[PDB]
Amino acid sequence: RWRGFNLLEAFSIKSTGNFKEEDFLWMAQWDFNFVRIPMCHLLWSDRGNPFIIREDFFEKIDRVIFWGEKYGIHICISLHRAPGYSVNKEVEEKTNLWKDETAQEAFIHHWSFIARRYKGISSTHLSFNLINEPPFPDPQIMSVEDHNSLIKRTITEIRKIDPERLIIIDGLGYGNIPVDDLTIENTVQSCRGYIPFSVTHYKAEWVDSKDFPVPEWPNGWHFGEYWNREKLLEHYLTWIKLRQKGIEVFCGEMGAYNKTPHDVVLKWLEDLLEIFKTLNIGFALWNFRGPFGILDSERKDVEYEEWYGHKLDRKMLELLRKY
Numbered sequence: 001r002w003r004g005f006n007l008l009e010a011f012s013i014k015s016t017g018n019f020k021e022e023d024f025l026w027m028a029q030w031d032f033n034f035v036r037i038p039m040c041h042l043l044w045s046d047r048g049n050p051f052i053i054r055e056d057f058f059e060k061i062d063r064v065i066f067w068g069e070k071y072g073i074h075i076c077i078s079l080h081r082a083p084g085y086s087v088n089k090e091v092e093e094k095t096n097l098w099k100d101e102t103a104q105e106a107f108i109h110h111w112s113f114i115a116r117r118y119k120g121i122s123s124t125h126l127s128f129n130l131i132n133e134p135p136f137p138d139p140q141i142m143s144v145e146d147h148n149s150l151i152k153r154t155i156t157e158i159r160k161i162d163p164e165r166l167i168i169i170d171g172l173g174y175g176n177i178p179v180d181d182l183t184i185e186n187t188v189q190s191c192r193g194y195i196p197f198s199v200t201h202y203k204a205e206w207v208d209s210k211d212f213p214v215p216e217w218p219n220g221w222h223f224g225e226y227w228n229r230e231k232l233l234e235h236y237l238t239w240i241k242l243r244q245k246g247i248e249v250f251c252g253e254m255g256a257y258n259k260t261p262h263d264v265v266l267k268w269l270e271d272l273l274e275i276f277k278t279l280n281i282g283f284a285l286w287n288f289r290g291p292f293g294i295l296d297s298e299r300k301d302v303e304y305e306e307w308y309g310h311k312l313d314r315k316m317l318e319l320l321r322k323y
């Protein structure tokens with residue numbers, strides 16, 4: 001079962017691409033075994049021409065794969081921005097990956113490049129997460145069939161190059177809805193652990209959060225609905241139903257932002273992790289270092305432990321380690 005973090009050094013158009021080896025050392029010493037790498041294709045491509053690939057960028061990803069091997073940490077490479085789609089609003093995509101043949105051609109071009117580069121790296125060490133958080137399947141933007149046909153033909157092209165490559169598929173509705181008609185060999189579907197937004201995204205600048213209620217748990221609030229541990233259990237039970245079709249599931253992003261009081265964060269995260277352990281669902285916290293992380297999270301109500309120049313939320317870490 002995968003347990004770990006997302007690392008963001010290739011996440012943004014302003015990112016350096018230089019991941020920190022000590023992140024891998026420390027999470028290995030804390031007995032974690034998984035990292036997801038959400039990548040912004042513009043770091044090696046172009047806004048106007050989605051077929052540009054600057055191969056030199058991937059020397060940085062080569063290092064991540066080496067460190068994954070060195071420290072026993074599986075690497076999941078993800079396209080967080082691809083031609084025609086990203087949830088990140090720092091750049092507006094002028095095309096629509098879900099409908100536009102040219103964007104889909106470029107999408108496959110990029111994944112074919114990546115598949116070819118790492119064909120020699122086994123799926124024990126490396127998986128591909130094709131696209132981060134597709135939206136709800138409003139067919140005027142992305143139908144269920146739009147999504148499934150694109151994923152299917154992308155997997156086909158990847159596996160002509162590397163037949164054994166493990167593929168991770170995000171749920172629809174921003175990683176929250178299982179995908180019914182994708183029963184493809186050697187795939188995993190990825191859900192999310194941000195429910196409820198009143199706890200996890202309180203005062204978040206990048207969503208419309210101004211009318212969220214004061215955080216509390218239980219009885220947190222999520223797009224009009226109130227949530228508790230039993231409701232979380234029901235939700236993730238619908239996810240592990242995919243195992244009856246030979247599909248594994250895991251939670252590719254989870255956590256709470258750094259303006260939520262710590263007592264609420266810990267009560268909510270404990271409940272989520274109790275459910276994930278109950279149902280044997282793996283997880284990745286959205287940050288290692290950062291606002292959603294166990295390190296350098298800039299919370300005002302935490303007694304941070306020294307961690308080699310960083311600030312460690314020990315209670316959050318130990319919750320993760322025990323589940």
Ligand SMILES: OC[C@H]1NC[C@H](O)[C@@H](O)[C@@H]1O
Nearest residue numbers: 038080087132133201253
């Ligand atoms: O995919 C990463 C993305 N997931 C959705 C979260 O709200 C956001 O904070 C994060 O940047």
